[PDB]
Design an enzyme around this catalytic site. Structure first.
Site, PDB file in Angstrom:
ATOM      1  N   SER A 208     -21.202   7.957 -39.801  1.00 17.50           N
ATOM      2  CA  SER A 208     -20.235   8.823 -40.522  1.00 17.50           C
ATOM      3  C   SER A 208     -19.454   9.740 -39.599  1.00 17.50           C
ATOM      4  O   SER A 208     -18.322  10.122 -39.887  1.00 17.50           O
ATOM      5  CB  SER A 208     -20.932   9.673 -41.611  1.00 17.50           C
ATOM      6  OG  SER A 208     -21.554  10.813 -41.032  1.00 17.50           O
TER       7      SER A 208
ATOM      8  N   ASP B 179     -25.960  21.168 -41.429  1.00 16.63           N
ATOM      9  CA  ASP B 179     -27.207  20.384 -41.577  1.00 16.63           C
ATOM     10  C   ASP B 179     -27.723  19.814 -40.265  1.00 16.63           C
ATOM     11  O   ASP B 179     -28.504  18.873 -40.278  1.00 16.63           O
ATOM     12  CB  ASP B 179     -26.990  19.232 -42.553  1.00 16.63           C
ATOM     13  CG  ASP B 179     -25.952  18.217 -42.063  1.00 16.63           C
ATOM     14  OD1 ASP B 179     -25.377  18.367 -40.963  1.00 16.63           O
ATOM     15  OD2 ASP B 179     -25.674  17.233 -42.804  1.00 16.63           O
TER      16      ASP B 179
ATOM     17  N   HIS C 276     -23.901  16.753 -39.069  1.00 15.01           N
ATOM     18  CA  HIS C 276     -22.477  16.467 -39.296  1.00 15.01           C
ATOM     19  C   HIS C 276     -21.603  17.676 -38.934  1.00 15.01           C
ATOM     20  O   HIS C 276     -21.553  18.642 -39.692  1.00 15.01           O
ATOM     21  CB  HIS C 276     -22.254  16.177 -40.803  1.00 15.01           C
ATOM     22  CG  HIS C 276     -23.007  14.996 -41.309  1.00 15.01           C
ATOM     23  ND1 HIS C 276     -24.171  15.120 -42.045  1.00 15.01           N
ATOM     24  CD2 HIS C 276     -22.808  13.667 -41.138  1.00 15.01           C
ATOM     25  CE1 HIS C 276     -24.637  13.917 -42.334  1.00 15.01           C
ATOM     26  NE2 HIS C 276     -23.825  13.019 -41.810  1.00 15.01           N
TER      27      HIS C 276
END
Ligand code: CL
Ligand code: CL
Lengths: 214, 214
Positions: free
Chosen positions: A15, A191, A194
Site C-alpha cells: 500500500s 500506526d 503507513h
C-alpha cells in the site's frame, strides 16, 4: 546508480507504494501515481530533470506480501518492459504474524521471504538496466520491540540478497531511524506503518539519493 | 530570510494554497494542510529541520481575490498570532476578468490589487518577524497572451509593493517559466492555473529556497 534518459521506471510494492494509484497501471499524467513516494519521485524527476524523460509507473498493491508480488510479477511488472524496477516489500509479511497471529496462511516467514526476493532479483536483473531493493520499514525506534526486531531481520535478508545478486539496496529504515531521534513516531504515521506526506518524502529522498538526483 | 525556531508560519492564499485544508484552520498533523505546496513546505521542514519546531498553518481559501483575503485578514490570519505570514494571491483577481468578463463586481483591477496588497503588508509587517509575498502565476509561456500579460503586470505590482516595504518577494512565476522551457503546460496543470503535484513541488521549493532550507 544512474537512471538513463528515456527510461521507464516501474515501482512495485504494497500500500505504501500503491497510495491509491490508477488501475490496471499507475502512470504519471494527472494523479495516476497516487499521492505518496512514487508520485514524489516522479515530481522531483520532472521538476529537476525534465530533459531526462523518465517515465515513472506505479504497480503497488495494498496488502501484498512478497508472495503476492511474485505471483503477479511477470504480468504486472515485466510485461510493462521496464528499464528499471524498484521493489519495497516485507512489512506485511511480518505484520500479519502480529495482527493475525493464528491466521498462519497469511504469514510469510523469513526463509520464504529471502528465497522469493532472490528469485525475483535473479529473473529480473538480466532484463533491466538496474533493480533497486528498498527496505521495508517500521516506525518504531525501540529495536527490541518484537515486531521491530522481526522487521530488522527481514531487512537484513533483503540486504543479503542485494549483496549476493549485486543490486542496489536503499536503507529506508535507516533514514527513518535517524529522523525518529528528532521526531516521535506519531508525527510520521498513525500506526507505525503507513506514513503521512512527511514519511513519503523521506522514502522519495532516499530513493532519489540512491539514483544520484539528490 | 530565515525562520527562527519554534515559530508559527501562517500561509494564506486562494485554492492553490487551500488544497483541501482543514476548517476553520489547517494544521500540519495528518493532512490538515491539504495536499499541495503548503503541505510540502511543512514536510520538508519536518524531515530536514525537525529541531526548528516550525508550526505551519494553512488558511488558503478557493476562489479568493485579494479583496476576499483582506476582508478576512484580521480574523483568519492575525488572530492566529503568526510569527511569519506568506501570501500568494492574484490569479483569481485576473482570471475573473477573462472567465466572467461581464460580471464586473467579481473583478479586482490592478490599482485595487496593488493598494490592497500595500495595506496587507503595512498592517502585518509590524506584527510579524517577516512576511513573504509569493507571486501568483499562470502556466502560459506566451507572454503576449492577454491573460498572461495581465498576470505579469499584477506580479510586478506585487514585486514593487514588496520592494517598498522591504519584505521578501518569491518569484514563483519565474520558476515556472524556466520549467515551461522543458515541459509543456499540460504536464503541469489541466487548465493553466491549478498545478499537479509537480507544480506544487515547484512552489514549495521556491519558498524553501527563499527561507534558506534549499
Ligand atoms: Cl541526523
Ligand atoms: Cl533552468
Amino acid at each position: 546508480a544512474m537512471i538513463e534518459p528515456g527510461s521507464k521506471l516501474v515501482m512495485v510494492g504494497d500500500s505504501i507504494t500503491d497510495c491509491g494509484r490508477a488501475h490496471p497501471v499507475g502512470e504519471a499524467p494527472r494523479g495516476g501515481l497516487g499521492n505518496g513516494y512514487v508520485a514524489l519521485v516522479d515530481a522531483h524527476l520532472q521538476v529537476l530533470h525534465p530533459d531526462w524523460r523518465i517515465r515513472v509507473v506505479n504497480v503497488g498493491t495494498s496488502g501484498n506480501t512478497v508472495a503476492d508480488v511474485a505471483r503477479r510479477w511477470e504480468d504486472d511488472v515485466m510485461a510493462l518492459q521496464p528499464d528499471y524496477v524498484s521493489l519495497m516489500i516485507g512489512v506485511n509479511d511480518v505484520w500479519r504474524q502480529f495482527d493475525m497471529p493464528l491466521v498462519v496462511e497469511r504469514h510469510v516467514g523469513i526463509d520464504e521471504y529471502r528465497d522469493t526476493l532472490r528469485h525475483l532479483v535473479a529473473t529480473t536483473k538480466p532484463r533491466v538496466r538496474e533493480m533497486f531493493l528498498l527496505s521495508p520499514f517500521y516506525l518504531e525506534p525501540n529495536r527490541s520491540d518484537p515486531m521491530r526486531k522481526t522487521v530488522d531481520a527481514y531487512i537484513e535478508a533483503m540486504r543479503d540478497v542485494a549483496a549476493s545478486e549485486h543490486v542496489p539496496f536503499v536503507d529506508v529504515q535507516a533514514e527513518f531511524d535517524r529522523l525518529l531521534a528528532h521526531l516521535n513516531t506519531w508525527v510520521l504515521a498513525p500506526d507505525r506503518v503507513h506514513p503521512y506526506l512527511n514519511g513519503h518524502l523521506v522514502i522519495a529522498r532516499a530513493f532519489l539519493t540512491a539514483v544520484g538526483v539528490l
